[PDB]
Amino acid sequence: CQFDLSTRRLKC
Amino acid sequence: DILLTQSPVILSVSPGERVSFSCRASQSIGTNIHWYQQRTNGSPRLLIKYASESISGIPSRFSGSGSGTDFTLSINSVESEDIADYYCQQNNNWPTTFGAGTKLELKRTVAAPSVFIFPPSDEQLKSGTASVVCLLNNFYPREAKVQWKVDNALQSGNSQESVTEQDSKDSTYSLSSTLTLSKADYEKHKVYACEVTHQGLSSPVTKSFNRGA
Amino acid sequence: QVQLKQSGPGLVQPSQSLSITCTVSGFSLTNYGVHWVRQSPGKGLEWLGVIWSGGNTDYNTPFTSRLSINKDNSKSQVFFKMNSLQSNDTAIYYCARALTYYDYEFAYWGQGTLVTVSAASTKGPSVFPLAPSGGTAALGCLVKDYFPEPVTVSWNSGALTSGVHTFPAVLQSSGLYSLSSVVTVPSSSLGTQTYICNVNHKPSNTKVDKRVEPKS
Ligand SMILES: *[C@@H]1O[C@H](CO)[C@@H](O)[C@H](O)[C@H]1NC(C)=O
């Protein structure tokens, strides 16, 4: 997926 | 460098169930693997070190096994606070390297969103921009549709959505849909509606307001 | 208790340098090494290097050229500096400490420093009220038009946390970020309690307290 800088969470 | 492959990419489980995360190494790394938890907006939290050794302050439902190339992180009874990403780390070989993580999602019962609409403030109107915000609060599952209408005209391309990650307590999501228009456009129209569609609603729910009322 | 606190989040011009201070307490830099790790969209978790108790440094292979770590034991500070940032150097940078002085099992982390590599200018946000109007009222703040991420929002100086949702920031076409933060409260408490969102955008030193009231 993506690693999202805003949330520090995997965003799939 | 050692390559660490974590599977699956997403795990979805119900509270109280057991759950396992796989970390696989490109060559044998003995038991030199560490595990981390990352919560929303968090720094990593060390859960298990050296494949199986416990860490102070980490709840006992966390445990790990494995040796060689195939490793397992286990939670014997999942709680809502476990909603997070999980990463493994090897340090048998320099440099220490991390896997790419597994996302832990929690299943729960359907909850219909509570819907709220917010007109633009008069403060913002002074800047010549108008933001109309629509809030869908505490729902499950994550899928939802927001449809904007201004004076019965379907709005398209002028809205953006943001969805929170799962709540650590009730496992719900919340969503904000922001409709952005120029002050000029905003003043030329009267009825602003956002229509919300969700599995837990038997009909779509509309919240609306008339400008200056 | 062991803590590591990093300097504030910020913007770095492309081809320019990144400096972060890690200030530690609860232990001495003469006894433990301090590691640096980043988390990028391109490469996830990536170990950068370490300054050991005795002042020696190791740097991960692709960083030997552009990375420098130093420290001041007395002041309990670790100094991280990386040259020549490109766009894909945008990441969260963390300092970290292991359980045992020589090891790499990271039990203690800094809070992370979000670093944006961009040519754009810093810009503080405007804060607008989301005014309230079955006994539960919703209210909030629209935090609009800032760069770069992040912004912090809390409610009533930390006192109000229950029922707070602070949405992930979204990037508008203008290249500026926007965000809302909401909270649900008893409608009977709107004539009694004050509701304030405390907004802090560190990269622009913009701090705003926005009182949010029912519209008249
Ligand atoms: C950034 O760009 C360089 C040059 O293409 C590449 O070698 C490096 O791996 C990239 N780093 C990332 C994605 O963090």
Numbering used by the authors:
A (entry chain E): 1 to 12
B (entry chain A): 1 to 213
C (entry chain B): 1 to 133, 139 to 221
Copy text from the publication:
Multiple strategies have been developed to modify monoclonal antibodies, including chemical conjugation and protein engineering. Recently, we identified a cyclic, 12-amino-acid peptide that binds in a cavity formed by all four IgG domains of the cetuximab Fab. Owing to the location of the binding site within the Fab, we have termed the peptide a meditope (medi-, middle, + -tope, place). Based on our observations, the peptide–Fab interaction does not affect antigen binding. Herein, multiple crystal structures of meditope peptide derivatives incorporating natural and unnatural amino acids bound to the cetuximab Fab domain are presented.
Superposition of the F3H complex onto the cQFD complex, however, suggested that it may be possible to increase the affinity by introducing a β-branched, unnatural amino acid containing a phenyl group. Owing to its commercial availability, we incorporated diphenylalanine at position 3. Based on this observation, Phe3 was substituted by diphenylalanine and it was found that the phenyl rings in this variant mimic the superposition of the Phe3 and His3 structures, producing a moderate increase, of 1.4-fold, in the half-life of the complex. Given this, every substitution at position F3 significantly increased the off-rate (e.g. nearly tenfold) except for diphenylalanine. Adding polar or charged side chains at those positions resulted in diminished binding, despite the presence of additional hydrogen bonds to the Fab framework. Despite the absence of a gain in binding affinity, the alternate rotamer observed for the histidine substitution at position 3 motivated the diphenylalanine substitution, which increased the lifetime of the interaction. We speculate that the affinity could be further improved using a β-branched amino acid in which the exposed phenyl group is hydrophilic and capable of making hydrogen bonds to the Fab.
